Design a protein around this motif. Structure first.
Motif, PDB file in Angstrom:
ATOM      1  N   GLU A   1       8.222   6.533   4.552  1.00  0.00           N
ATOM      2  CA  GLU A   1       7.627   6.239   3.410  1.00  0.00           C
ATOM      3  C   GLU A   1       9.043   6.494   2.223  1.00  0.00           C
ATOM      4  O   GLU A   1       9.406   7.509   2.057  1.00  0.00           O
ATOM      5  CB  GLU A   1       6.490   6.899   3.123  1.00  0.00           C
ATOM      6  N   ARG A   2       9.460   5.372   1.559  1.00  0.00           N
ATOM      7  CA  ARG A   2      10.046   5.632   0.414  1.00  0.00           C
ATOM      8  C   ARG A   2       9.467   6.066  -0.787  1.00  0.00           C
ATOM      9  O   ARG A   2       8.380   5.419  -0.995  1.00  0.00           O
ATOM     10  CB  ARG A   2      10.878   4.444   0.341  1.00  0.00           C
ATOM     11  N   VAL A   3      10.086   6.914  -1.510  1.00  0.00           N
ATOM     12  CA  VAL A   3       9.505   7.338  -2.986  1.00  0.00           C
ATOM     13  C   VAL A   3       9.478   6.016  -3.809  1.00  0.00           C
ATOM     14  O   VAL A   3      10.447   5.617  -4.091  1.00  0.00           O
ATOM     15  CB  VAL A   3      10.263   8.365  -3.444  1.00  0.00           C
TER      16      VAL A   3
ATOM     17  N   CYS B   1       4.601   7.538  -2.317  1.00  0.00           N
ATOM     18  CA  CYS B   1       5.499   6.984  -1.371  1.00  0.00           C
ATOM     19  C   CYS B   1       4.992   5.687  -0.824  1.00  0.00           C
ATOM     20  O   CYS B   1       3.777   5.517  -0.502  1.00  0.00           O
ATOM     21  CB  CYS B   1       5.983   8.031  -0.421  1.00  0.00           C
ATOM     22  N   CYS B   2       5.867   4.443  -0.690  1.00  0.00           N
ATOM     23  CA  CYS B   2       5.352   3.429  -0.092  1.00  0.00           C
ATOM     24  C   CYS B   2       6.125   3.234   1.208  1.00  0.00           C
ATOM     25  O   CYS B   2       7.244   3.141   1.273  1.00  0.00           O
ATOM     26  CB  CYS B   2       5.791   2.361  -0.861  1.00  0.00           C
ATOM     27  N   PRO B   3       5.422   3.149   2.307  1.00  0.00           N
ATOM     28  CA  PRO B   3       6.028   2.920   3.728  1.00  0.00           C
ATOM     29  C   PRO B   3       6.824   1.819   3.578  1.00  0.00           C
ATOM     30  O   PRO B   3       6.650   0.709   3.045  1.00  0.00           O
ATOM     31  CB  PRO B   3       4.807   2.754   4.719  1.00  0.00           C
ATOM     32  N   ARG B   4       8.033   1.880   4.488  1.00  0.00           N
ATOM     33  CA  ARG B   4       9.004   0.755   4.610  1.00  0.00           C
ATOM     34  C   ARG B   4       8.495  -0.417   5.790  1.00  0.00           C
ATOM     35  O   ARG B   4       9.337  -0.818   6.325  1.00  0.00           O
ATOM     36  CB  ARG B   4      10.147   1.389   5.062  1.00  0.00           C
ATOM     37  N   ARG B   5       7.085  -0.862   5.423  1.00  0.00           N
ATOM     38  CA  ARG B   5       6.447  -1.637   6.275  1.00  0.00           C
ATOM     39  C   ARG B   5       5.275  -2.054   5.942  1.00  0.00           C
ATOM     40  O   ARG B   5       4.424  -3.023   6.192  1.00  0.00           O
ATOM     41  CB  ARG B   5       6.388  -1.289   7.881  1.00  0.00           C
TER      42      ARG B   5
ATOM     43  N   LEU C   1       0.920  -1.217  -0.002  1.00  0.00           N
ATOM     44  CA  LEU C   1       0.210   0.045   0.134  1.00  0.00           C
ATOM     45  C   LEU C   1       0.974   1.333  -0.072  1.00  0.00           C
ATOM     46  O   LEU C   1       1.878   1.453   0.759  1.00  0.00           O
ATOM     47  CB  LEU C   1      -0.889   0.064   1.204  1.00  0.00           C
ATOM     48  N   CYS C   2       0.568   2.055  -1.042  1.00  0.00           N
ATOM     49  CA  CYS C   2       1.378   3.370  -0.903  1.00  0.00           C
ATOM     50  C   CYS C   2       0.325   4.484  -1.055  1.00  0.00           C
ATOM     51  O   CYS C   2      -0.736   4.334  -1.231  1.00  0.00           O
ATOM     52  CB  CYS C   2       1.982   3.367  -2.379  1.00  0.00           C
TER      53      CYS C   2
END
Length: 32
Positions: free
Chosen positions: A15-17, A28-32, A3-4
């Motif tokens: 959140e990583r781009v 951005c998609c969270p790193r979890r 989920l982003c």
């Protein structure tokens, strides 16, 4: 998980781009 979210100007500290959402918006998609 799988989920982003669109962020304005920049993602939050977690959140990583993953891509671009639009003018001044980044997907951005969270790193979890």
């Amino acid at each position: 998980g799988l989920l982003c979210y669109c962020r304005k100007g920049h993602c939050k500290r977690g959140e990583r781009v993953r891509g671009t959402c639009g003018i001044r918006f980044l997907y951005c998609c969270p790193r979890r």
